[PDB]
Design a protein around this ligand. Structure first.
Ligand SMILES: NC(=O)NC(NC(N)=O)C(=O)[O-]
Ligand SMILES: [Zn+2]
Ligand SMILES: [Zn+2]
Ligand SMILES: [Zn+2]
Ligand SMILES: [Zn+2]
Lengths: 410, 411
């Protein structure tokens, strides 16, 4: 079965990738761009000619529908986002949507009409790579997006949001949409964007949950001084202070173990010169975990450690916690069905978590949802060097087709 | 005496500071600029009217001479540099030259001509704040300059070193000058540019040595990864590696104790974003000490420590040592005389070292030399806000005058 989809991929993937191709390398889609519009239009046509009822909702999300026989109003959905970042992609997002179409087209030819309605979706924007807003697609599906937060009061480097939208043929609503209550289940296939599958030698990941997140901005204020005339004992060096904090905290994170992660990726000393003790340093913090209580307890302890260190050195501290989102588990029953399914099939799988956010995180709190991971080479993502071995890709489409059978044909 | 020099300063300092005043703030008197020219011409005229024999040497160093009666060929010299940084203060450099003139003028009228000749000097440039070269003034006095190093390396912002020099009435030599060999001693009075004297409520500092210096640029190469999907055990975090290096090295430096200083003042991670493990970091190192062997051995140990940490983390490292200068001690006899003079006058002093370079380091290995420090409030320098209490400035001129009396009016 793996070899069948293998071919389907070789004929469809290169075709889809042509639209939005960037000479500078990789993929460059971006919300409401001429390249965006052409992609959806081309994809909608292909689907319609396949025998599925196609449509665009109010903001550009694309659907492909196959009606069920006894519970036609209960729908099983599957898909991913159609947009990308500025350079390179080809697999992130669009593959999950391509897969759902391949799976559904195959299911219909082998078993005819399903008993429950099944649908494929190509969502508009999951990566705010053009405008200062994220999840414009999935959010409007559940009516969580407020038109005010994007009206004109906001735009990219020149063009207005409302203009680019109407330029593609869609009118910005006057109020939030009506939430969908007809969705019985949602399944999203994505590339992991990591190395865990490769390093443990596997091919399919059963996602149990989506990690919660916390992002800080911290500012330390000491005193700038002559690097040669000021003895060590008279100093209030902000870089040395940062160093004690980073070193100590990273170590602590390591002892706690997976799935905990801690990163200090942006640092800005002032004046930032070789012969001047820096009296100021601005830095960031990024911490994640699957358990809400652990996330809170660990980051709270760090706040106490930073405070203790700085009070000792007599350096002032300013802590700004600007991103605080909780963990998102996947439906308990759906995970069980998928797991026992992998067992039944001789699939080389692994139960794991997602260290990154996906459209799936907004569906989950409203309807039963789950995700399927496929490995990525060298954990590369968001750049042209993104790639996965085709036999792994086929294994993904195959496993997606099986879950959908169990949910709408069984 | 203190109150006499206080009044002298109050009258002359504002006058001299007027030439080179910057509307943008502070002082801006760069090498061979019109402001530089006027300052040197006005100061020379005033010294002449005062009764001194004045002249300019080949590169613009200005002198004020008073000939001695017994050993006319022997010269006791005192002064400092007249140039400044872009928006600096009105004490760094020029005060030292001002004080020498004021001291000699008082000594002259109180005791008459000296046994040996005495000279005031206002050197061309010590900051290198305009052109890419430093010590163009003091280096030429001892024939260490060499014109080929500035003949082409001329560039303020399209301004030629040779042209600005000619614009001021000076022509660069065809070869290194003939070193002076008549200087019996050199004494430089200068602000501390630090906070040691102020913190201890003292007013005079007897310097015994000038520190040596080392500066590096180090690059670390690891790997950039996704901050969420990449487990801790699979990372090559260059910011984590830097912090480990900075933290433990500073620790070792503090244990060593004064006069050792160590600083990591510049850090540049890439890509420098909140959700991306940084795969590259470039940073700097500044280290100084008064003992040549310790300076060399401590930084070499640091070099080995960095390599260990990086090899253990599988991170590539490049170490670039671009500045490496030796420390210079001040003449033992002169230091003794100055120390003894301070006790005798019940002065509130302290013996300390200089954590910064000065023209004095260029004179020391060739002729007996020493320095006198005064306090710097809040240790501020090279900034429009550098200041020093006026009675402390007065104290400095007085100490400088008593020292010159010992060296030239006594046999
Ligand atoms: N060269 C130095 O080490 N010191 C420098 N640092 C200051 N002033 O903070 C300077 O030259 O002004
Ligand atoms: Zn993405
Ligand atoms: Zn994605
Ligand atoms: Zn200076
Ligand atoms: Zn100076």
């Amino acid at each position: 079965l793996i070899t069948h989809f293998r071919q389907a991929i070789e004929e469809t993937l290169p075709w889809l990738s042509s639209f939005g191709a960037d000479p500078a390398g990789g993929m460059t889609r971006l919300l409401y761009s001429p390249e965006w519009l052409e992609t959806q239009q081309q994809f909608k046509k292909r689907m319609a000619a396949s025998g599925l009822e196609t449509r665009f909702d109010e903001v550009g999300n694309l659907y492909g529908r196959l009606n069920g026989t006894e519970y036609p109003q209960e729908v099983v959905l599957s898909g991913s986002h159609i947009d990308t970042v500025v350079n390179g992609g080809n697999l992130d997002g669009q593959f999950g949507a391509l897969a759902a179409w391949l799976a559904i087209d195959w299911l219909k030819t082998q078993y005819g009409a399903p008993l429950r309605t099944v649908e494929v979706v190509a969502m508009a924007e999951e990566e705010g790579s053009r405008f200062p807003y994220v999840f414009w697609g999935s959010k409007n599906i559940f009516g969580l997006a407020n038109p005010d937060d994007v009206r004109n009061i906001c735009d990219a480097k020149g063009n207005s949001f409302v203009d680019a939208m109407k330029a593609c043929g869609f009118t910005l609503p006057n109020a939030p949409l009506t939430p969908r209550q007809d969705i019985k289940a949602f399944v999203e296939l994505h590339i992991e964007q990591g190395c865990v599958l490769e390093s443990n030698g596997q091919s399919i990941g059963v996602v149990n949950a989506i990690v919660g997140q916390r992002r800080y901005t911290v500012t330390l204020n000491g005193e700038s001084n002559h690097a040669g005339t000021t003895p060590m004992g008279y100093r209030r060096d902000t870089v040395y202070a940062f160093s004690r904090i980073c070193h100590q905290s990273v170590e602590k994170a390591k002892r706690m173990g997976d799935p905990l992660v801690l990163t200090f990726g942006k640092v800005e000393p002032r004046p930032n010169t070789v012969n001047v003790v820096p009296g100021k340093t601005t830095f960031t913090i990024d911490c994640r975990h699957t358990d809400a209580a652990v996330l809170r307890d660990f980051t709270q302890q760090l706040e106490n450690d930073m405070r203790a260190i700085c009070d000792e050195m007599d350096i002032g501290i300013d802590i700004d916690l600007w991103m605080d989102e909780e963990p998102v588990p996947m439906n308990k029953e759906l995970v069980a069905t998928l797991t026992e399914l992998c067992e039944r099939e001789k699939l080389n799988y692994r139960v794991m978590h997602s260290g990154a956010g996906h459209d799936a995180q907004i569906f989950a709190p409203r309807v039963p949802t789950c995700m399927i991971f496929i490995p990525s080479i060298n954990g590369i993502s968001h750049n042209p060097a993104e790639r996965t071995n085709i036999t792994d890709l086929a294994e993904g489409v195959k496993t997606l087709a099986l879950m959908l059978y169990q949910l709408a044909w069984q």
